[PDB]
């Protein structure tokens, strides 16, 4: 999934947010491994996505 | 198993309408996002209309009130109906099943024809 | 900052509903009680500053 933004930081045991409670909501027990990157590259058009 | 599905077309009709509509094959179809993906050599990515399955669109923030989609199940056939068209709006339209939160069992079509030039 | 006022809620019930009303209502970090189960405490005095 994409969230929004450099918001990754948000998918942490602990951490509360907008998109992180009410979107994609990680438990506090959570075992296990986050990856993230950007994809200005890959998902880029000349006016907008 | 089968698609049924972008099955139509139009020609160079600057200022006009575009009555493209893609059907869907009796199959179990309860959850389907139908959408509308341009596929001009460059832009590929493109999200037109929205097919949520309570009956509510959204519409994307650069077409705003400029794209109309209605439900239709009389013959099992979604319409489309747009107005005001450019002339950069020659591409190759489709109508994806499996649109973004997918791409799993994703399955495309093969094009409608639809291009203008003034 | 340094002339922060201070308005004291008393003699009234706090139904924390209206409280959720502005889009960026982000930090919203509680310390000694948690975000919920607070429709069921009964304080002594409330405070707020600015």
């Known amino acids: 999934f994409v969230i929004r933004g450099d918001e990754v930081r948000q998918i942490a045991p602990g951490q509360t947010g907008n998109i992180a409670d009410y979107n994609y909501k990680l438990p506090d027990d959570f075992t296990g491994c986050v990856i993230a990157w950007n994809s200005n590259k890959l998902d880029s058009k000349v006016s907008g996505n | 198993e089968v698609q049924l599905v972008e099955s139509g077309g139009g020609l160079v009709q600057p200022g006009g309408s575009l009555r493209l509509s893609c059907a869907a094959s009796?199959?179990?179809?309860?959850?389907?996002?139908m959408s509308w993906v341009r596929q001009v050599p460059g832009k590929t990515p493109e999200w037109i209309g929205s097919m949520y399955p309570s009956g509510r669109t959204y519409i994307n923030p650069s077409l705003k009130s400029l794209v109309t989609i209605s439900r239709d199940n009389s013959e099992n056939m979604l319409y489309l109906q747009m107005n005001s068209l450019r002339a950069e709006d020659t591409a190759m339209y489709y109508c994806?099943?499996?649109?973004?939160?997918?791409?799993?069992?994703?399955?495309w079509g093969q094009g409608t024809l639809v291009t203008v030039s003034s | 900052v340094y002339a922060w006022n201070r308005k004291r809620i008393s003699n009234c019930v706090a139904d924390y509903s209206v409280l959720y009303n502005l889009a960026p209502f982000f930090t919203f970090k509680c310390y000694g009680v948690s975000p919920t189960k607070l429709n069921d405490l009964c304080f002594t005095n409330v405070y707020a500053d600015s």
């Open positions: 994806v099943s499996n649109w973004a939160s997918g791409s799993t069992g994703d399955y």
């Open positions: 009796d199959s179990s179809f309860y959850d389907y996002e």
